[PDB]
DNA sequence: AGGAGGGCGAGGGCGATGCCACCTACGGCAAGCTGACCCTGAAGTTCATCTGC
């Protein structure tokens, strides 16, 4: 288990419902929490698994309308001209977040030869303490960086001390099981937070 | 010639240096306008275009 300690000035774990008008999930999504732990280290042998988020700064919001673009980019049309494809996505962002994601991982079917769980474990451990990553972890949106740390047990004060808000059914981790290589056909599994007692435990599927 | 050229101690004492009121009146402190254009939508289909046949 790794008690990595994602933190950042802003964060947007955009609720699936309020995607066009981004309203962040009140805490780190276990998908966004996990994909962060793939940004620091991943390989198609490691399969990350968030075991317990722990909120470390209170759920505080700042709305940010960004002139986002409306349409994907495409081989077909060789430019956007944003002023033609403009959209103004509001973003109820999570200001001053922090999350100590108690996450571990497993070995996939394609673990390869060097399937050593300890190898990837210490690889990620060195990456996180050193600060290395494949990708500066995205707090839900890459516009938001995860000023992370690989805590050992506990090195920050979690604010939802007494029993606190149950954020309801949050996106857990989009189901890339039916997908071929590179996540084509997925689905969304979702979870009762369970509550936020003081740091939400997640459910392994 | 050799003189002596003041010695003394007073040089204010007393009180008053203001009294009276007034220190503003009047009214106005805004008028008139604008405070935004423009777009950017969901949802769906069409339509032009592409790939494959």
């Amino acid at each position: 288990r790794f008690i990595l300690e994602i933190s950042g000035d802003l964060a947007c774990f955009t609720r699936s419902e309020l995607k066009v008008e981004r309203v962040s999930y009140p805490v780190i999504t276990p998908s966004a929490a996990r994909n962060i732990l793939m940004a620091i280290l991943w390989k198609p042998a490691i399969r990350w698994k968030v075991l317990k988020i722990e909120i470390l700064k209170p759920i505080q919001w700042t709305n940010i309308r960004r002139n986002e673009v409306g349409t994907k980019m495409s081989e077909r049309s060789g430019s956007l001209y944003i002023e033609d494809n403009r959209q103004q996505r509001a973003s109820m962002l999570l200001k001053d977040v922090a999350y100590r994601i108690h996450a571990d991982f497993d070995m996939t079917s394609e673990a390869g030869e060097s399937d050593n769980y300890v190898k990837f474990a210490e690889m990620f451990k060195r990456r996180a303490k050193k600060g290395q990553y494949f990708h500066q972890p995205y707090l839900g949106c890459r516009e938001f960086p995860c000023d992370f740390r690989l805590l050992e047990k506990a090195e920050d004060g979690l604010p939802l001390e007494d029993i606190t808000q149950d954020f309801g059914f949050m996106l857990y981790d989009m189901d890339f099981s039916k997908s071929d290589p590179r996540d084509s056909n997925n689905a969304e599994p979702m979870f009762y937070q369970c509550k936020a007692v003081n740091g939400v435990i997640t459910v392994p599927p």
Side-chain angles (χ1 to χ4, degrees):
Chain A
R1 281 258 302 248
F2 314 97
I3 298 89
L4 176 140
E5 197 261 327
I6 291 312
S7 169
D9 291 331
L10 261 50
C12 194
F13 323 100
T14 300
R15 295 199 143 262
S16 294
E17 58 258 61
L18 301 149
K19 192 173 198 307
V20 295
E21 288 320 317
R22 286 167 179 281
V23 181
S24 179
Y25 274 125
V27 299
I28 190 167
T29 298
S31 84
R34 172 182 64 95
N35 312 340
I36 284 163
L37 301 150
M38 294 184 287
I40 288 188
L41 167 64
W42 188 77
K43 192 72 66 70
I46 190 167
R47 183 69 176 85
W48 274 100
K49 164 180 61 166
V50 174
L51 273 300
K52 164 176 175 281
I53 295 91
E54 170 171 337
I55 302 93
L56 294 174
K57 282 186 185 172
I59 296 90
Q60 169 182 195
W61 312 87
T62 77
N63 315 269
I64 300 298
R65 281 180 65 187
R66 286 182 313 269
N67 296 115
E68 296 294 329
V69 76
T71 61
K72 308 253 182 194
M73 316 198 263
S74 62
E75 182 65 26
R76 191 67 55 88
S77 171
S79 283
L80 276 296
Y81 304 108
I82 54 157
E83 307 149 80
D84 205 1
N85 296 115
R86 166 59 73 230
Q87 296 292 143
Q88 316 209 88
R89 295 177 72 169
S91 292
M92 185 180 288
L93 295 175
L94 287 174
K95 189 210 186 315
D96 291 331
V97 298
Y99 303 98
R100 63 167 51 105
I101 295 89
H102 300 64
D104 186 74
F105 59 90
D106 291 331
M107 294 296 172
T108 62
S109 61
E110 54 269 4
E113 189 273 336
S114 67
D115 74 314
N116 188 359
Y117 158 85
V118 176
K119 186 191 86 169
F120 294 83
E122 296 304 319
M123 185 180 288
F124 164 77
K125 199 166 297 294
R126 292 183 291 113
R127 268 157 188 236
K129 293 181 176 67
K130 178 86 94 164
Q132 315 179 191
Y133 55 74
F134 181 96
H135 185 193
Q136 160 70 230
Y138 76 109
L139 271 157
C141 295
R142 293 179 66 189
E143 302 83 1
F144 311 122
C146 295
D147 292 331
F148 60 90
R149 193 159 63 259
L150 194 69
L151 295 199
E152 280 305 324
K153 37 199 73 174
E155 281 84 7
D156 202 323
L158 72 165
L160 293 185
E161 280 288 330
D162 207 39
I163 311 303
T164 56
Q165 182 178 33
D166 171 85
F167 312 107
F169 266 92
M170 290 219 303
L171 170 63
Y172 167 71
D173 188 358
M174 283 212 195
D175 174 28
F176 310 109
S177 64
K178 290 176 297 301
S179 285
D180 49 17
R182 291 59 171 201
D183 67 0
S184 310
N185 297 115
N186 81 318
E188 290 90 349
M190 310 181 166
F191 77 125
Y192 264 125
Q193 203 63 227
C194 183
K195 201 178 292 188
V197 298
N198 46 359
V200 64
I201 62 170
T202 61
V203 177

